[PDB]
Structure formats: structure tokens, C-alpha cells
Amino acid sequence: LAGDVISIDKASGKITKLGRSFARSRFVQCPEGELQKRKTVVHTVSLHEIDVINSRTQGFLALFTGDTGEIRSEVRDQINTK
Amino acid sequence: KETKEVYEGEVTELTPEDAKTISHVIVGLKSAKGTKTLRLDPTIYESIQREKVSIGDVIYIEANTGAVKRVGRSDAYATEFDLETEEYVPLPKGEVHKKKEIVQDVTLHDLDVANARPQGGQDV
Amino acid sequence: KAVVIDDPPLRQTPEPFDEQSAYNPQSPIAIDFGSSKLRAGFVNHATPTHIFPNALTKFRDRKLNKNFTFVGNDTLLDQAVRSQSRSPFDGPFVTNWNLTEEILDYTFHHLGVVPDNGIPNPILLTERLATVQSQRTNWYQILFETYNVPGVTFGIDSLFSFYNYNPSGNKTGLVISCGHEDTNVIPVVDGAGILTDAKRINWGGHQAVDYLNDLMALKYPYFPTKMSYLQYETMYKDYCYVSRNYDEDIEKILTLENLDTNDVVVEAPFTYDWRNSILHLFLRGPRPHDSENIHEQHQMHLNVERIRVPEVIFQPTMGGQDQAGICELSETILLKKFGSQPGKLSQTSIDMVNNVLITGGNAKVPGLKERIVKEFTGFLPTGTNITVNMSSDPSLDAWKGMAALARNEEQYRKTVISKKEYEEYGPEYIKEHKLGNTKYFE
Amino acid sequence: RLLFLRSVGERNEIGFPSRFKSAHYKKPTRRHKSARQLISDENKRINALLTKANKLVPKATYFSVEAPPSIRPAKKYCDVTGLKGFYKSPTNNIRYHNAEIYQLIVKPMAPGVDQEYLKLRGAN
């Protein structure tokens, strides 16, 4: 709606509602500076996560359910070489 | 000893030909070095319709395996709307047709695993 | 480094006259009635004999002689007379014709012509592509009732330049003409200009210099002095080029490592850091600016306008025209026309690709040839041989066109229209030859 | 410095009964008929010819030779600097490049300046 503060990713199309602006008539400050921003995000992904994702038997949800179930050594070697 | 063959570029022509069953698919890709027009069997259109490929989408086609990957739309259609859900990739500076000789190192256990999936196969 | 611009210099040497002994009465005469410059001379010569701008003034004096003979190169004598120049062209067409009568009398007097009962030489005249009927009827009127010429031919200067660089007369090629007031793409099949599929962009050199004038007036609204059209003409001529790829070039014009090389500084003739500020880098370059001195208060910094002005012939939407660009029009001729599927080139469409001709007076800008070749590679299939032809001077090749038509090939009389043909057909007569116009209907 | 103009003045004197002209001269009275209305009465002459002949097809006229508008979307540029115009102000309908340009030029501008900024691309 009007007055909402949102963040838009142009590629994936994800729109996140950060809240409402400071208007009496939850509450988040209005963003400042540029609108189309280019920011650097930094990721640290463990080798076990790439092991689970590269394993074709189970998806990335096994990082949370915990049923990875004896990931094979060829996936480990492929992850090491990559 | 296997051969990797890759067709990539912006789609400038996507015209099917029926006989409700598609017979052959004419696809004209475009890169910075020129264009290339290819016939295609209906299985690649099944993969393309899976990938919702339209005119102007820079795509990736492997000739031997039929793998279709949509990189995104081109910058020529980046100003059709001021704000758009689509992502925009530049025109590839290489040629449309790329050939490569690569070496596949597999083991017998890999083929045993791939031939004995207990539930079934999975997509790429 | 500051570069001082000024008014263009004046030719203090007066123009000469042709000898009367070299006058031949049955020899034809070539006249290129351009919107910017007029090229006149006799066909037997190779180079044109008279190059002068297509304008004249009406001088006034305290002795009250009312002399108005300052025509063409006579205007390049004093600063006061040059400001009162008056071309007969408003846009692409001519609005007043007695002005053209004075111009034609001037160029007939300076070519060593001593006639009787009108001009006895057949003229070789150029006309605009798909010109209006009224201009053609008025041209017939002036040519056949004020000068009484034996024969008239009509043609397009782009097709004349194509005939000049393909003198066989049956070649197949593509002509791109960058004129003064319009830009034309004309495909030629077997020596015949196919004018039912030619296209015209409403943009030329004059519109480009006017666009640069408007851009520079918008960039510095508080500039103390006002510059003339010739000054903007010389900045368009000297400090403009076609970018190889506009999208990647415009991404980094304003960067600091690029602004110290290709940004020029123009000085008007008279007698909280700024590193991350885009507006100051655009306005005053990569140097710090202070506004207390009159020396740099008369300063321009053409940076984006070095590539923005020549890009309008490729994107006419920037100049206000809802028209396709040069490469877009070139793509739809030889990929979606003339029996050519996109992806499958016909044999005719191959032949124009090997015979691309770029001509016109506005082809003088650098980088136009490489941009055309690169863009032609983009839509054509791989392996197609894109060969372009560009003259050393693409302005005088139009005069060499009718020089090589009425002299080299004896089928020039296949294109002439006699005075007796004018009586039996009228002012609406069109002779559908290869190098000229066509009828308006089917 | 002033006699040069007189020297080229009666150097090139051509009289009213000029020998380049014919013996019969008979110049008629002609109106102005500038660039803007020649297109219009040629247009209405062509439409009168089509309506008279129908109630045939033209081949190469002044309007049939005109280039059509493009089918690819035009790139949007900043109206102030000519850079890549990401944004566009909603009040004065002026495209701009970044925040500094909007705060300095686009927002605090006089009325009527925007209508001649838009006159360059003809959006007034």
C-alpha cells in the first residue's frame, strides 16, 4: 500500500516488506540515498552444505531435517576438485 | 572421449511447425559474431516450454544432450518496462556454435549407482 | 588542455572565372543542388570546378546601388555579409525560387558561359528521393521557361555516387546516404535503385548541429556570449565521433580515468570533493572549477556530446523522430525483404552485403565505418562477408556521379528529357530510369 | 577593406534583362509555400487521388518512403546529462541519472525549462 517501505530484487522478483514508514495517520525508517543500489553481500558456506546440495539423492532441506544419509565419496571428491 | 557442442545466444526467431503435434522447430539464435538458425525436434520445444523461453531470451542449448538453460533476457528488451521481474543478461561476444573435446572420467561404481537408483531417476 | 574555438576563417582570395575558349555549347553541365553546398562544373573534367555554399545575401550601401550579387563563395569575404546569408532551403525543400534564379545566374556566369536565348547546354541535376510533385513541376517550369535547356535529367545523389563507384551500371549494392537534412537507405538491384523499399530518416548534418546547439545551450544556461551556427558546425566537425558500442561507452564516459583523455575543452572567443560528483564532472571535466575568472567562465566541456550527437542517426528517438535507426533499417531490407527469410540469405541479399556503400556529406565523422561493420555482423548470419566502401571524400562523389554518367557511358541519353518531351507530356512527366525517381503509383 | 566588397559587387553584376534568360521571361506570381504546408497539400492531393481512383495502389511517395518506427524498445537516457537514465521524476516528467542530479537540476528547476528539455526527444 501507500507508505510501505519495500525492497525489490529485479532479477528474482522477491519483494520484501520492511514495514511502514514513520506516519501516524512495524515501523521502519525511510531509506536514504540512492534507490537502485549496488551492494556487496558476503557468503560463507561450509563444505558440508555444498556436499548436501551437490548430492542428487537429497536436496538442501537435509541441512535442516538432518537426514543426509551417508553422502558418497565421489560427491566429496567432486566438491574438493571444484 | 566425448564431444561438447553448445549453441547459445539471444532468441530472435521461435517458429514451430505442426503435423496439434509439433513436427520441427525453427530457432534462430543470435550473438555478437552473427546468427545461426537451427531445426529442432519437439522434445527441445518441450524443454523450452518448460523453461518459458520467449523472443529475446538469451538461452543455452547443448546439441548432444539437449539440455536447455535460459540465462535471461537481452539488454535490447531491457527498456520495454521501467520495472520488470525479468533479469537482463548482455549479448554474448563469442560465436553461437562452440565445439569442444572433453574427457569423461567415470568409475564402475558410478555406473552401478546410476543404474541402480531404487526410487528412480531425477532431472538435471 | 584548453582549446580556443573561434569563428571559421574567411577566404580573402576571390573566386576565379572559367575561360570562354573552353566553353563547348553541346557539352553537358553538372550541377549538384545540395541543401548545404552546391557543386557545379562541366562533365569533361574529373574534379568539380566550383564548390560554394548554397546561399546568397543582399548587400546594402550608402551609395544606394542595391547590389545583391554576393552568391556562394562571395559570402566568405566579410563577417557582416556572412551573417546575412540566406539559403533557399527550409528543411529538405526549396521555398523561394527567384533566389534560386539568382544562384543559377551566378553559377552560369562563373562557368564561362556566353549563351543566346537561354542556356544551350543540357544540365545534370540532382533531386531529393521521392520528392513532392509541386517542386518537380516548378523545377520543370524554371528549367524549361527561364533557361530553355535542351535536355534535363533527374536523379538522386546517393544513386549518382553508387554509379560513380560502380560504373558498370548493373551492379547490386546497398547505399546509405548521410545528407544535410535527411538520411536514406536505398537498395540497388542490378543497377536499378529499388525506390519502393528505400527508407528515409528525418535527420541529417543540419539537425545534428542544431541538436548540439540545443544541448550546449541547455548545458550552460548562463553563458555570457552567444555563438553562431558555424561555431557549432566546427565543434560537430572536429570533436565528434561514432562510438563502437554506445551502451558500454556511455557506462564509463564520466569515470575519472576516462575523463582526462577524451574530454575536450572549448573556449569562447572574447577579448565534499568533486571526484564522486557526477554533475561537476559532466559540467567542468576532471579539473577543479572556480568561477571568479573570466578565462574559464567562457568554457565548454564536450564529453558525452562527442558520442551523443552522432548516435542520433542510429537511434532517432533521441532526436525526437519516431523512426528506426540505420542498422535497423539495414536489417529489415536484407533480412525481412526481397525474398529473404531471417537466417537464410538470398543471392540478391548477399550481393548488397559485399557492396555496401556509405556516402553523403555527413559521413565525415570518425568511427562510422567501423560501427556499421560491427552492427552488420550482429544480425547477419555467421560467415557473411560484409564489405563496405567509403570514399576519401564522401561529399564530392555525387558530382563525380553525373561526371561519370554523361561522359563514360553513352546511354546517358537514355535518362535525358528533351524540351519536346516536356510539351507532349507536361510538368507531371517522370522518366523511370535506373538513377532517378519513379512514378507515384502502380 | 571596404572596396573589396564593391570590387566583387560590380565584378559580378548581372542585369535584369540577363542574357542567361530567354527572350521571353514571363515570371508568374508565386506564393511563399514553405516546408510545413507542402507536405500537407501533397498529402491531400494524394488522398484525393486515392479516393477518386477507388471510389490504384501508390508505389513510392514522400510518405511511403518514410522510415517506420522501430519494433525494438528505445533505450531511456537521462534528460539532463545524456547518461543512462534509471529514474524519472513524477512531477515534471524528466528522466535523470542519479540522486545528485535530481537534487541539483531536476527538482529545483524553473517552469518551462522541462518543456524544452523534453523538446529534444519531442515529449512535450
mmCIF file with all atom_site columns, C-alpha atoms in Angstrom, chain B residues 18-107:
data_model
loop_
_atom_site.group_PDB
_atom_site.id
_atom_site.type_symbol
_atom_site.label_atom_id
_atom_site.label_alt_id
_atom_site.label_comp_id
_atom_site.label_asym_id
_atom_site.label_entity_id
_atom_site.label_seq_id
_atom_site.pdbx_PDB_ins_code
_atom_site.Cartn_x
_atom_site.Cartn_y
_atom_site.Cartn_z
_atom_site.occupancy
_atom_site.B_iso_or_equiv
_atom_site.pdbx_formal_charge
_atom_site.auth_seq_id
_atom_site.auth_comp_id
_atom_site.auth_asym_id
_atom_site.auth_atom_id
_atom_site.pdbx_PDB_model_num
ATOM 1  C CA . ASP B 1 18  ? 2.808  -28.704 -36.603 1.00 0.00 ? 18  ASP B CA 1
ATOM 2  C CA . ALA B 1 19  ? 1.932  -32.027 -38.305 1.00 0.00 ? 19  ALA B CA 1
ATOM 3  C CA . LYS B 1 20  ? -1.709 -30.489 -32.578 1.00 0.00 ? 20  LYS B CA 1
ATOM 4  C CA . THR B 1 21  ? 1.675  -32.241 -32.665 1.00 0.00 ? 21  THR B CA 1
ATOM 5  C CA . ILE B 1 22  ? 4.771  -30.177 -33.451 1.00 0.00 ? 22  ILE B CA 1
ATOM 6  C CA . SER B 1 23  ? 6.891  -31.634 -36.253 1.00 0.00 ? 23  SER B CA 1
ATOM 7  C CA . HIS B 1 24  ? 10.004 -29.436 -36.303 1.00 0.00 ? 24  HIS B CA 1
ATOM 8  C CA . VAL B 1 25  ? 11.045 -26.249 -34.522 1.00 0.00 ? 25  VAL B CA 1
ATOM 9  C CA . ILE B 1 26  ? 12.941 -23.433 -36.229 1.00 0.00 ? 26  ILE B CA 1
ATOM 10 C CA . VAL B 1 27  ? 15.064 -21.486 -33.734 1.00 0.00 ? 27  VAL B CA 1
ATOM 11 C CA . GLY B 1 28  ? 17.302 -18.602 -34.732 1.00 0.00 ? 28  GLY B CA 1
ATOM 12 C CA . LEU B 1 29  ? 19.912 -17.728 -32.127 1.00 0.00 ? 29  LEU B CA 1
ATOM 13 C CA . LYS B 1 30  ? 21.927 -14.516 -32.224 1.00 0.00 ? 30  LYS B CA 1
ATOM 14 C CA . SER B 1 31  ? 25.262 -13.469 -30.747 1.00 0.00 ? 31  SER B CA 1
ATOM 15 C CA . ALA B 1 32  ? 27.725 -10.639 -31.370 1.00 0.00 ? 32  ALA B CA 1
ATOM 16 C CA . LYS B 1 33  ? 29.556 -12.553 -34.119 1.00 0.00 ? 33  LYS B CA 1
ATOM 17 C CA . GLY B 1 34  ? 26.405 -13.426 -36.055 1.00 0.00 ? 34  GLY B CA 1
ATOM 18 C CA . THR B 1 35  ? 23.289 -15.573 -36.089 1.00 0.00 ? 35  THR B CA 1
ATOM 19 C CA . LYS B 1 36  ? 22.547 -19.253 -36.625 1.00 0.00 ? 36  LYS B CA 1
ATOM 20 C CA . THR B 1 37  ? 19.227 -20.897 -37.494 1.00 0.00 ? 37  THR B CA 1
ATOM 21 C CA . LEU B 1 38  ? 18.583 -24.450 -36.297 1.00 0.00 ? 38  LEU B CA 1
ATOM 22 C CA . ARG B 1 39  ? 15.943 -27.088 -36.744 1.00 0.00 ? 39  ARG B CA 1
ATOM 23 C CA . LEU B 1 40  ? 14.832 -28.804 -33.538 1.00 0.00 ? 40  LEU B CA 1
ATOM 24 C CA . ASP B 1 41  ? 12.804 -31.871 -32.603 1.00 0.00 ? 41  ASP B CA 1
ATOM 25 C CA . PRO B 1 42  ? 9.646  -31.419 -30.445 1.00 0.00 ? 42  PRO B CA 1
ATOM 26 C CA . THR B 1 43  ? 11.491 -32.661 -27.325 1.00 0.00 ? 43  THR B CA 1
ATOM 27 C CA . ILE B 1 44  ? 13.606 -29.497 -27.277 1.00 0.00 ? 44  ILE B CA 1
ATOM 28 C CA . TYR B 1 45  ? 10.409 -27.431 -27.576 1.00 0.00 ? 45  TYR B CA 1
ATOM 29 C CA . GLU B 1 46  ? 9.071  -29.437 -24.613 1.00 0.00 ? 46  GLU B CA 1
ATOM 30 C CA . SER B 1 47  ? 12.200 -28.406 -22.690 1.00 0.00 ? 47  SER B CA 1
ATOM 31 C CA . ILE B 1 48  ? 11.881 -24.809 -23.970 1.00 0.00 ? 48  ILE B CA 1
ATOM 32 C CA . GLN B 1 49  ? 8.221  -24.565 -22.926 1.00 0.00 ? 49  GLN B CA 1
ATOM 33 C CA . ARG B 1 50  ? 9.373  -25.923 -19.574 1.00 0.00 ? 50  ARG B CA 1
ATOM 34 C CA . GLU B 1 51  ? 11.883 -23.049 -19.492 1.00 0.00 ? 51  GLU B CA 1
ATOM 35 C CA . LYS B 1 52  ? 9.269  -20.468 -20.729 1.00 0.00 ? 52  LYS B CA 1
ATOM 36 C CA . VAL B 1 53  ? 11.619 -19.178 -23.420 1.00 0.00 ? 53  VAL B CA 1
ATOM 37 C CA . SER B 1 54  ? 10.243 -16.245 -25.424 1.00 0.00 ? 54  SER B CA 1
ATOM 38 C CA . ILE B 1 55  ? 11.647 -13.995 -28.149 1.00 0.00 ? 55  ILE B CA 1
ATOM 39 C CA . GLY B 1 56  ? 14.726 -12.151 -26.913 1.00 0.00 ? 56  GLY B CA 1
ATOM 40 C CA . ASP B 1 57  ? 15.726 -14.558 -24.139 1.00 0.00 ? 57  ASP B CA 1
ATOM 41 C CA . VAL B 1 58  ? 19.423 -15.443 -24.188 1.00 0.00 ? 58  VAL B CA 1
ATOM 42 C CA . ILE B 1 59  ? 19.431 -19.225 -23.857 1.00 0.00 ? 59  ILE B CA 1
ATOM 43 C CA . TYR B 1 60  ? 21.852 -22.164 -23.789 1.00 0.00 ? 60  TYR B CA 1
ATOM 44 C CA . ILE B 1 61  ? 21.422 -25.292 -25.924 1.00 0.00 ? 61  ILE B CA 1
ATOM 45 C CA . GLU B 1 62  ? 23.639 -28.367 -25.779 1.00 0.00 ? 62  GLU B CA 1
ATOM 46 C CA . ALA B 1 63  ? 23.468 -30.225 -29.083 1.00 0.00 ? 63  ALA B CA 1
ATOM 47 C CA . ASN B 1 64  ? 24.374 -33.737 -27.928 1.00 0.00 ? 64  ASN B CA 1
ATOM 48 C CA . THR B 1 65  ? 22.324 -33.929 -24.716 1.00 0.00 ? 65  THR B CA 1
ATOM 49 C CA . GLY B 1 66  ? 19.514 -31.473 -25.447 1.00 0.00 ? 66  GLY B CA 1
ATOM 50 C CA . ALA B 1 67  ? 19.988 -29.516 -22.222 1.00 0.00 ? 67  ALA B CA 1
ATOM 51 C CA . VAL B 1 68  ? 18.204 -26.154 -22.388 1.00 0.00 ? 68  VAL B CA 1
ATOM 52 C CA . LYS B 1 69  ? 19.095 -23.358 -19.962 1.00 0.00 ? 69  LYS B CA 1
ATOM 53 C CA . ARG B 1 70  ? 17.585 -19.862 -20.029 1.00 0.00 ? 70  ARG B CA 1
ATOM 54 C CA . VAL B 1 71  ? 20.187 -17.295 -18.986 1.00 0.00 ? 71  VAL B CA 1
ATOM 55 C CA . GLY B 1 72  ? 17.783 -14.363 -19.199 1.00 0.00 ? 72  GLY B CA 1
ATOM 56 C CA . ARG B 1 73  ? 16.513 -11.624 -21.453 1.00 0.00 ? 73  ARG B CA 1
ATOM 57 C CA . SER B 1 74  ? 18.761 -9.372  -23.523 1.00 0.00 ? 74  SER B CA 1
ATOM 58 C CA . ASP B 1 75  ? 19.507 -5.688  -22.970 1.00 0.00 ? 75  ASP B CA 1
ATOM 59 C CA . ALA B 1 76  ? 17.660 -4.798  -26.183 1.00 0.00 ? 76  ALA B CA 1
ATOM 60 C CA . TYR B 1 77  ? 14.413 -5.599  -24.350 1.00 0.00 ? 77  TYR B CA 1
ATOM 61 C CA . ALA B 1 78  ? 15.585 -4.112  -21.046 1.00 0.00 ? 78  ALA B CA 1
ATOM 62 C CA . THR B 1 79  ? 13.625 -0.885  -21.633 1.00 0.00 ? 79  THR B CA 1
ATOM 63 C CA . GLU B 1 80  ? 10.223 -2.349  -22.506 1.00 0.00 ? 80  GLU B CA 1
ATOM 64 C CA . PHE B 1 81  ? 9.220  -1.557  -18.915 1.00 0.00 ? 81  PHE B CA 1
ATOM 65 C CA . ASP B 1 82  ? 10.757 0.711   -16.302 1.00 0.00 ? 82  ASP B CA 1
ATOM 66 C CA . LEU B 1 83  ? 10.440 -2.041  -13.684 1.00 0.00 ? 83  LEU B CA 1
ATOM 67 C CA . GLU B 1 84  ? 10.296 -5.725  -14.561 1.00 0.00 ? 84  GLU B CA 1
ATOM 68 C CA . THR B 1 85  ? 10.604 -9.107  -12.842 1.00 0.00 ? 85  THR B CA 1
ATOM 69 C CA . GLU B 1 86  ? 12.871 -10.393 -15.636 1.00 0.00 ? 86  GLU B CA 1
ATOM 70 C CA . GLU B 1 87  ? 16.648 -10.388 -15.339 1.00 0.00 ? 87  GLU B CA 1
ATOM 71 C CA . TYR B 1 88  ? 18.751 -8.975  -18.163 1.00 0.00 ? 88  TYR B CA 1
ATOM 72 C CA . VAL B 1 89  ? 21.990 -10.503 -19.448 1.00 0.00 ? 89  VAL B CA 1
ATOM 73 C CA . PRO B 1 90  ? 24.225 -8.997  -22.167 1.00 0.00 ? 90  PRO B CA 1
ATOM 74 C CA . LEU B 1 91  ? 24.712 -10.367 -25.647 1.00 0.00 ? 91  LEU B CA 1
ATOM 75 C CA . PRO B 1 92  ? 27.493 -12.996 -25.627 1.00 0.00 ? 92  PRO B CA 1
ATOM 76 C CA . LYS B 1 93  ? 30.562 -11.808 -27.510 1.00 0.00 ? 93  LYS B CA 1
ATOM 77 C CA . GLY B 1 94  ? 31.514 -15.296 -28.693 1.00 0.00 ? 94  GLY B CA 1
ATOM 78 C CA . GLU B 1 95  ? 30.178 -17.324 -31.570 1.00 0.00 ? 95  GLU B CA 1
ATOM 79 C CA . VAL B 1 96  ? 26.831 -19.103 -31.454 1.00 0.00 ? 96  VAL B CA 1
ATOM 80 C CA . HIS B 1 97  ? 28.299 -22.515 -32.293 1.00 0.00 ? 97  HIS B CA 1
ATOM 81 C CA . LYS B 1 98  ? 31.012 -23.751 -29.924 1.00 0.00 ? 98  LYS B CA 1
ATOM 82 C CA . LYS B 1 99  ? 32.624 -27.189 -30.123 1.00 0.00 ? 99  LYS B CA 1
ATOM 83 C CA . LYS B 1 100 ? 34.852 -28.823 -27.533 1.00 0.00 ? 100 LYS B CA 1
ATOM 84 C CA . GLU B 1 101 ? 36.570 -32.158 -26.943 1.00 0.00 ? 101 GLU B CA 1
ATOM 85 C CA . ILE B 1 102 ? 36.463 -33.225 -23.292 1.00 0.00 ? 102 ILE B CA 1
ATOM 86 C CA . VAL B 1 103 ? 37.382 -36.355 -21.348 1.00 0.00 ? 103 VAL B CA 1
ATOM 87 C CA . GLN B 1 104 ? 34.851 -38.065 -19.072 1.00 0.00 ? 104 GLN B CA 1
ATOM 88 C CA . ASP B 1 105 ? 36.490 -39.951 -16.193 1.00 0.00 ? 105 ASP B CA 1
ATOM 89 C CA . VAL B 1 106 ? 33.917 -42.229 -14.569 1.00 0.00 ? 106 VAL B CA 1
ATOM 90 C CA . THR B 1 107 ? 34.256 -45.372 -12.479 1.00 0.00 ? 107 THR B CA 1
#
